Design an enzyme around this catalytic site. Structure first.
Site, mmCIF file in Angstrom:
data_model
loop_
_atom_site.group_PDB
_atom_site.id
_atom_site.type_symbol
_atom_site.label_atom_id
_atom_site.label_comp_id
_atom_site.label_asym_id
_atom_site.label_seq_id
_atom_site.Cartn_x
_atom_site.Cartn_y
_atom_site.Cartn_z
ATOM 1 N N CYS A 140 -0.100 4.200 2.183
ATOM 2 C CA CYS A 140 -0.067 4.045 3.629
ATOM 3 C C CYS A 140 0.296 2.669 4.177
ATOM 4 O O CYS A 140 1.478 2.313 4.241
ATOM 5 C CB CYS A 140 -1.296 4.614 4.336
ATOM 6 S SG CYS A 140 -2.884 3.964 3.697
ATOM 7 N N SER A 141 -0.714 1.906 4.595
ATOM 8 C CA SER A 141 -0.467 0.580 5.152
ATOM 9 C C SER A 141 -1.638 -0.368 4.998
ATOM 10 O O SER A 141 -1.716 -1.390 5.669
ATOM 11 C CB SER A 141 -0.079 0.714 6.629
ATOM 12 O OG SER A 141 -1.031 1.486 7.353
ATOM 13 N N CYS A 142 -2.555 -0.026 4.106
ATOM 14 C CA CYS A 142 -3.713 -0.873 3.858
ATOM 15 C C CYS A 142 -3.371 -2.361 3.846
ATOM 16 O O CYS A 142 -2.537 -2.818 3.063
ATOM 17 C CB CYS A 142 -4.537 -0.411 2.659
ATOM 18 S SG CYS A 142 -4.874 1.383 2.746
ATOM 19 N N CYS A 177 0.912 -1.140 0.000
ATOM 20 C CA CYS A 177 0.000 0.000 0.000
ATOM 21 C C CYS A 177 0.949 1.186 0.000
ATOM 22 O O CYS A 177 1.384 1.635 1.067
ATOM 23 C CB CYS A 177 -0.864 0.034 1.261
ATOM 24 S SG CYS A 177 -1.935 1.520 1.369
HETATM 25 CO CO 3CO Z 1 -2.628 1.814 3.723
#
Ligand code: 3CO
Ligand code: 3CO
Ligand code: 3CO
Ligand code: 3CO
Lengths: 156, 217, 120, 152, 216, 120, 152, 217, 118, 151, 119, 216
Positions: free
Chosen positions: H109-111, H106
Site C-alpha cells: 500500500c503506502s505505509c 510499501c
Molecule cells: Co502502506
C-alpha cells in the site's frame, strides 16, 4: 426523465469498457508460439468478417463529407483511366491495410489512403512528392491561401 | 478547420491531375454522374414488373437487359462506357414470393448496385451488418422491424464477386388499381435492399439516427 | 523503369462491359446448374473473395453467372486466365451449427469461381 | 467436418484480434474520474440487463459434485440462520467485484462467498480456514483420499 | 482434485465443526434437491388447461395452486418456511392468443426451484441476462421461437422475491388428450418461456452439453 | 465478540413463509393497481435490486405483490422496516430507444419496492 | 516545443494500439479454470510487488480538501474504535476487488471503504447512506452549499 | 460543481458524527495534528546521529526511543495516545554505510512513518513504484538520479507489517564543522525515503512535475 | 453489538504493538536462523507478499509480538505471535538479477506462522 | 516448485490488469482526431522511445527454416528482385500493426519474400496458392518435405 | 511491366553500396559542427527518421556518405541522391524526464539532408 | 512440420522455378552465412588496442580497417557489392574513459553481420528497440553493466546504411597480453556494447536459451 434515461444509456455503454478479460499483449513471439490456428488468424484477409459474432447496434445513416465524395470520384477516375481496376483497389484498400487500420480508421479514410498508395506503388509519384505535396497543402492553409472547396482564402 | 483527410484528399487529387492520370474535367464528370444516381430507377423496375408478367420474367432472368427499360444501361450509362469500375455490369434481380424473401449484403465490403440504386447506406457498410446478416438474418431483420413466417425461405445474398442485386418485393395488399408511379413510390431504398417490405402509405425509408458530417456535401 | 498499360482495360471493355468482355474465354464449364459442390479450403494468403464461412460447406449451383479472371488474379494485375463463376445456394443449417430447425428453409446465396469447387 | 471445425475455430479466434484503444488504469488521480466513470466503477456488478452482447449457442452443463455440495451448504447456512439469501446475493454477486464476477465460474462465486460469510461473521478465523485448506491439500497428497471426490 | 473441490470440503467441514448446520441438514437438503424437477410445474399447466377454474386460481394465487401438484412452497422444503433462496411467492404467467411470456433474472439466476427444479446453465449466463430484456424477439428466435408482431411478448424479470413459471397456450392437435398426455409436452423450456409445447415433442430441444469434470 | 442471532428468521417464518411473515407490517400502500409511476434514480452504492435499465422510466402498477424489507436493508441484516412491493409493467419502447414500432405491444414486468416509486 | 509535445503525445497514443489477444471472460465453466487462474483470481489485489511495469516520470500531487477530510475521518473511526487500521486495509486494498483497486483513485478507495464500514457494522443502514447522498445533492442543487467545498 | 467524492465525503462525515462514532472536534483535532507533521524531526534525528556516535547506536537499535530525542513520541504525540492507528509504534532507523544503502517502500500500500516524516509522496503510493522498486531497485533509483557502486549492498525495505522506516544516509563530504541545523537542512524527505542522498547545498527535494488538485488544501 | 472501547483501553499509554508484548510466549526462531517462507493459502487476506513464497532468508531481528494481520484484519486478536525481520538475497527472489549486483538484498517482516527451518 | 508457481503467478496477473478497453469498429471521420490520425498512419517499425517493461532477455536457436528464409531474402536482393530497403518497407511497415507484433520476426521475413514474388508479378497469387496446397499434401502423404522431414 | 534486375549489380559490383552513389549528391548543405533541428516531415507509408527525433536539435559530427533517401529507395526510386549526416543529440533534449545526474549522455543516429534545417 | 516450413519450401521452389535466383546461389549464401561470427570483430579490437595507428584507422575508416581482419565489406560477400542488407559502411565506435557506446536498431535489427555474425534474439526484440535509446542506464544495468554518472553513455541507433561495432577500452589486468589473449575476452556482447571485456571472461554472460523446433 430524458436526462435520467440519457445517463442510463450512457452507463450501459460505459460499462462495456470495463468488461473483464485476459489481455495478452503480443511482442513478436517466437515461431514456436504460433499454432496453426494462430497462423491462419494472422494471415487472414481483414475484409472477411462474415459470421463473426457482434452485438446489436442501432443503425444510423451518415451525411457524406465533401472530401468523401471527392475521394470516391478520384478512385473511380483512377480506375476509369487505367491506373488500376476496382479489384486491385479492394485488395489494397480492404486487405493490405492490415487488421488495425482496417477497423480503426474510417471507411473512406481507407479509400483515400489507398488512392495515395497506388500513386506511389506504381511509381506515378515518388513518396517524396507525396510528402512534399502534404506539406504544401498545410502551408497553403496556414498562410491563409485556403484549401480548395474546404476552406476559402482568409479575408479582412 | 481542415482535417487530415481533406488535406490528403487535396494532395492526392492535385498529384493525380498533375501526372495526367485523370483530368479535372474527368473528376467533375464523375461527380456529376454520381449526382444523377438514386433509388428511383430500381423502384420503377419493380413497379413495372408488378404490372407486367413478361417484364417480371425478364427481370428475374436478365437484370441487365431489364434495367434498360428504366433508363439505366449498366454498360453505357456510366461515363466510362464500360460500366462503372466498381459496380460492374451484372445486375441480378431477386424476386420475393409468398415463400421466399431476399435481403442483400456484401460481407467483404460494401458492394451495392449504385448505377440503378444510388449510394449505399452508412449502416450497409458497417462491419456489424456485414458480420451479422449472413448468420442471424432473422434477428437483424427483426431489429429493422421486419418479420417473415418461419416457413418462408429467407435467402441472404452476399455479393462477393461481380454481381450486384436489388430485391423485387412481393406486391403489397391495398394497391388495387394503383398506377406505376403509385406503386414505385412505396418501393424505398430499404425495400430494394431487403431490410423492409413495401407498405401503402410509406414512401420513405424508416426514420433512423442521422450522423452529421463535419463538412457535408 | 516499369511501364504500366493504362489503356488496355478500356480498349477491351468499352461498349462491351465487364465481365461481358471475358465471355467465352473460360471454355467449357466444369460444373452445371443442379450440381452439388463442396468449397475447397484453398490458401487465402494475401487475397481471396471466397469467404471463410463457406469453406468445406456443400451447396447447390443454381446459375452460371459469367466468365472472368478470378479476383485472386485480377487484384494483382493478372488477367491472362479466365474461368467460370457460379452462383451457389447453401442451406443455413449447413453453415451455422446453431441455426434453428424452425427456420429450416433459410438459405444463403453467393458467387464462387470454379477453382474453389469440387463435386460433393 | 474437420474443415468446418477449423472454420468455426477461426471465426472465434479472430475475435481475440479485434482492434481497440486499450487504456490500462493504474490508480488515476481524482481529476481523471468523471461522473460517468465514477458511476461505472461504483456500479453493482450483478446489474447487467440491457448491456450489449453477442449471440451465443446456449448449452446445458452437467452439475459437478462440488457444485451440488456448495448449493446445499449455502442453503443450509441460510436454513440455520447464518445469513438470509439476500445477504448471500449481495456478497456473492456484488461484493466480489467486477473482475471475479465475470472471470470466475457461477458456483465458484457461491463457494467463495460461503467461505466468506464464515469469516466475516467470525464463526471461523481466516487462520482456521487457511489451515483447513492446507490440511485438505496434505490429506489428498498423502493418498488418504478426499470425501466422495477422491477415494484413498 | 481441483481447487473448488478442496475448498468445498474445507468450507463444509468447518461449518459442521462450528455447528452452523449439521451433516444431517446437508444430506437432507441434497435429498430434497434430488426430488425436484419440471414434472410438478408441467402437471400444473396440464390441470389448468383441463380446468378453467383451476387456471383462474393459478393466475391469481400461484402458491395455493401449487399445492394441487404436491408442491407446498412453505412446507415442502426442509426449512418449513420455504427454501431460503426461492421464497414463497410463485406467480403463474398465463399466455394467451395476444400475450406470450418469457422469464429471466438479470441480477442472477432466480428460478422457481421448488416446482421446476434446477435452472439451466444458459439461464444463469451473463449473456442471456443482458439480452433477453432488451432483444427478446431476437433471443427467442435463436431458440427457434417466433410469434406474431401484434402479439405482446412480455419479459418477466424476477428481481425480488417472486418466482414465475409460464403457462403456455394449449397447442392445437390435443383434442381429448388426458392430463398425462398434456403434461408430457410441457417441457422445462416451455415453463421458462423460450419454447412452446407441441404434440409429439416431450423433451427440451437438443443443445450442446458441457460435461462436468466429476458429474453428480 | 458480536453475537449473531441465528434463530430469529426461523422463529419468525416457520409454518408461515417468506415474505408471508412480513404481511401487514408495511401499513397502507402509497400506490394502487393502475397508477402510473416513474422510477426514481436513487443512489445505488454497494447494493440495489432495482435495475439501472428502469431508472427514470414510467410504467403501470399491475399488482401489489407482497410486503417485505427492501433488499437494500435485508442484504445488510436490517429488517426493522417493511414496505410494499409492486409489480410494474413497462412498454419496451420506453426502455430501449431503438425498439421497433413493429413490436409496439411488447412489455417488461418486474418488481420494485415503494421507495423507488413516485406518481407519474 | 509544440513538435516535441506532439511527439510525446504520439509515443503515448501508440501504446493504446499495442496488439494483443484479448479474451473476454463471461463466467467460464469450472473446467476452464486452471490452478494458475484460480490463484490469480483469488489473489489479494494489493500484492503487486515484483510485477512488471514501465518507467514513468514520477510526480507529486496537491492534496484535495476532500482527501485530507477522508484521511482524518478514517483515522478518527479507528481512534474511536469503529475499526483498526488492519481491518481498513483489508477492506480498502483487498475487498474492493481488482477492477476498482486500479481503476479508482487512491483516496477514492479510502472514502468508499469508510462508507462501507459504517454499513457493514450496521452503524447506519444502506438506506440512510443512500438518503444522505440524496440530501447532499439536493443541498447543492438548491444553492444551499456543501461544507467548505461549495459556499451557499 | 462539486465532485462525487466531495458529495460522498460530506455524507460519510455527517453520518459518522450524527451516529456518535466520532465528534466534529475529533475530526478537527486530527486535521490539526496532520498539519503539524513534516520531515524536520527525522532530519534532526539524522543530524544528531551524525554528530553523536552513542545516539546513532540508539537510533539503529531502537528507533522508537531515539525518536523521543527529537520531540516525537510515537505513542503519546498522536491524539490517540496509543500511536496513530495506521502508523503504529515501531519505528526502525536504517543506517547506510560505505557498503550499504537503503531505500523504502510499501508494496502492499503506502505505509509511511508519518509521525516523524509527514505525509507520503504521491509517487510513493503508485502501483508503479510499489511494483518495481523491490525487483529493479538500481533501475528505479537511477531514474531518481541515484547510482551506487555495484559492490555496495543496496537493501530494499518493504514495510509490510507494523514497522515503519526512515533512512539515515551516510554523512556527505564537505560538511566539516557544520552545525546540527546545517546538517538537518540537507536531509530532505527523499533522503529519508532513500531515493536520494544528502548533498551540501541541496535543501529541497528534486523538482518533479506537480499534479494539481481540483480543490486543494 | 460492537465493542468500540476495547482497543483504546488496551493500548492507551502503551502503544501498538507494545500492548501485545509477552503474549506470544517463546519464539520458535532466533536471529541468525535460516528460514523458508511457507506458501500458505492467501484467500481473502495476507500480508506476506507472493514474491517471497518458497524463498529462503535469514532472520536478523525479532521485531515485536502481535496477532497476525490475517486475524487482526477480521477483528480476531485472541492469538499473538512473534514477528521476524527477514533478509533475502535479491538473486534468490528474481531469477534475472545480475551477478554484478550480488550483494543487494531485500528486508521485510513475516509472522512466525509462515516460517519453517530451511 | 513454489518459486516456479510464484513467477507464473506474477506473469498471469498481468493479464488481469484493469483497463478501459474501447473496441474500434470503423469509426466515422468525425471520431478521428489528428492525434489518432497520426497514430494510425504511423510506420509500425518506429518504436524507439515507447514505454515497455523489463524482461529477462534470452537467446534463441535458429530454426532451419529461418536460416533458409534469410538466405532466400538475401538471394532475391542479390539477383535484383528487390533491394534491402524495399524489403524493410514491405516487411517492417506494410504488414501493419497487428501482424508486425503478433507474428514472429522471421515469420514477417518469409511472408514478405512470398509477397514480393506476387507484387512484382514474378508468380501469380494462384501459383503461390497452388504451390502451398501441393506442399501441404506433400507432407501429409508421407512423401517428405525437403530437409525438414524425410520420406 | 518489366523489372530491371541487373541495374543494382551492374552499378555496385566491385564498388559497394553506398560507395556506388559517391559524388552524386553534389555539395553538402551542411558541415561538421553545424547545429540542426529535425523537421517533422510527413511520414505516411515510410520513413527512417524516427519520430523520437522530430523537432529536436542536434550537432552534425560527420557526413557519412551519399545515397538516395530510404523514402525513395524503398519504392524503387534511386534517381535522386543526397548527403547523409550522423547527428548527436543530448539525451535531455529528447527525453524530458532524463536525469541531470547523467547530463552527459547522448544519442547518435543518421539523418538524410532533407530532414535538416539550421538550428 | 509448421506452416512456416511449408511456406519456406513454397517460396524457395517458386523463386528457383522462375529463375529469380539459383539453387547454387542459395547454398552459396548459406555457406557464406556459416562462416560469419564475432571473431573478426574481436580481433579488430585487439589489434587496435595493440596499435595506436591502426586504432586511428578503425575510428576514421571502419571499412578499410576491417580488411586487416580478413573481412572486406565489398568483396567478402558472394555479391561482390557487399551483402544487400548490411551494406558497406562499417563504423567503429571507440570507447574512452569518458565515453561508452551501446548499439541498437530501433527500426529493426540492423547489425554488422559481415564482421560480427548473426544478431542476438533479444537485439531484435521490440522491447530492446523501445527502451535502449531512452533508458540506456537502466537497460545496461539489467545486463550487469554500470558506468560512472560522469561518463558519457552514447547510444548509436543504426537507422540508415551504417553498421557499428563497439571498441571498448582495454581492461586492467591484461598487461603484456598477446593479440590472441586480448581478442579472446572481446565477446559479441562487448562489440554490441551491453558488456565490457574482463580478464578471464571469454563467453557471453549466460542467459536463457529458447530452443528451436528444428535447430541448426
Ligand atoms: Co502502506
Ligand atoms: Co462491397
Ligand atoms: Co437470480
Ligand atoms: Co535493423
Amino acid at each position: 426523465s430524458s436526462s435520467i434515461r440519457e445517463e442510463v444509456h450512457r452507463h450501459l455503454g460505459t460499462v462495456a469498457l470495463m468488461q473483464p478479460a485476459l489481455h495478452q499483449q503480443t511482442h513478436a513471439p517466437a515461431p514456436t508460439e504460433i499454432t496453426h490456428t494462430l497462423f491462419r488468424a494472422y494471415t487472414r484477409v481483414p475484409h472477411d468478417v462474415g459470421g463473426e459474432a457482434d452485438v446489436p447496434i442501432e443503425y444510423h445513416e451518415k451525411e457524406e463529407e465533401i472530401w468523401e465524395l471527392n475521394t470516391f470520384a478520384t478512385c473511380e477516375c483512377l480506375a476509369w483511366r487505367g491506373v488500376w481496376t476496382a479489384e486491385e483497389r479492394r485488395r489494397k484498400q480492404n486487405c493490405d491495410v492490415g487488421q488495425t487500420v482496417y477497423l480503426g480508421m474510417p471507411y473512406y479514410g481507407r479509400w483515400l489512403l489507398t488512392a495515395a498508395r497506388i500513386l506511389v506503388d506504381k511509381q506515378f509519384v515518388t513518396l517524396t512528392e507525396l510528402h512534399n505535396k502534404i506539406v504544401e497543402m498545410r502551408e497553403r492553409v496556414a498562410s491563409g491561401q485556403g484549401l480548395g472547396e474546404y476552406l476559402p482564402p482568409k479575408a479582412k | 478547420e481542415v482535417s487530415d483527410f481533406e488535406i490528403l484528399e487535396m494532395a492526392v487529387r492535385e498529384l493525380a491531375i498533375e501526372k495526367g492520370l485523370f483530368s479535372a474535367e474527368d473528376h467533375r464528370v464523375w461527380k456529376d454522374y454520381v449526382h444523377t444516381l438514386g433509388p428511383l430507377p430500381a423502384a420503377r423496375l419493380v413497379a413495372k414488373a408488378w404490372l407486367d408478367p413478361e417484364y417480371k420474367k425478364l427481370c428475374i432472368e436478365d437484370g441487365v437487359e431489364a434495367s434498360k427499360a428504366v433508363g439505366v444501361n449498366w454498360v453505357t450509362s456510366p461515363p466510362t462506357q464500360f460500366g462503372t469500375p466498381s459496380d460492374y455490369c451484372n445486375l441480378r434481380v431477386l424476386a420475393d414470393s409468398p415463400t421466399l424473401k431476399h435481403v442483400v449484403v456484401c460481407t467483404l465490403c460494401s458492394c451495392y448496385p449504385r448505377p440503378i440504386l444510388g449510394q449505399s447506406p452508412e449502416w450497409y457498410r458497417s462491419p456489424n451488418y456485414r458480420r451479422r446478416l449472413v448468420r442471424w438474418p432473422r434477428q437483424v431483420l427483426a431489429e429493422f422491424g421486419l418479420q417473415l413466417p418461419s416457413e418462408v425461405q429467407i435467402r441472404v445474398a452476399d455479393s462477393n464477386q461481380k454481381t450486384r442485386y436489388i430485391v423485387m418485393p412481393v406486391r403489397p395488399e391495398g394497391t388495387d388499381g394503383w398506377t406505376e408511379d403509385q406503386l414505385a413510390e412505396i418501393v424505398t431504398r430499404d425495400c430494394l435492399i431487403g431490410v423492409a417490405v413495401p407498405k401503402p402509405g410509406i414512401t420513405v425509408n424508416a426514420k433512423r439516427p442521422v450522423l452529421k458530417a463535419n463538412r457535408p456535401v | 523503369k516499369p511501364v504500366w498499360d493504362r489503356t488496355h482495360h478500356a480498349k477491351m471493355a468499352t461498349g462491351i462491359g465487364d465481365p461481358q468482355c471475358f465471355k467465352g474465354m473460360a471454355g467449357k464449364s466444369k460444373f452445371n446448374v443442379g450440381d452439388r459442390v463442396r468449397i475447397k479450403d484453398l490458401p487465402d494468403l494475401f487475397y481471396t473473395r471466397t469467404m471463410t464461412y463457406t469453406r468445406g460447406a456443400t451447396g447447390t449451383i443454381v446459375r452460371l453467372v459469367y466468365e472472368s479472371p478470378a479476383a485472386e488474379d485480377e487484384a494483382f494485375g493478372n488477367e491472362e486466365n479466365v474461368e467460370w463463376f457460379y452462383s451457389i445456394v447453401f442451406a443455413q443449417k449447413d453453415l451455422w451449427p446453431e441455426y434453428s430447425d424452425t427456420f429450416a428453409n433459410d438459405t444463403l446465396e453467393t458467387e464462387i469461381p470454379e477453382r474453389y469447387l469440387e463435386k460433393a
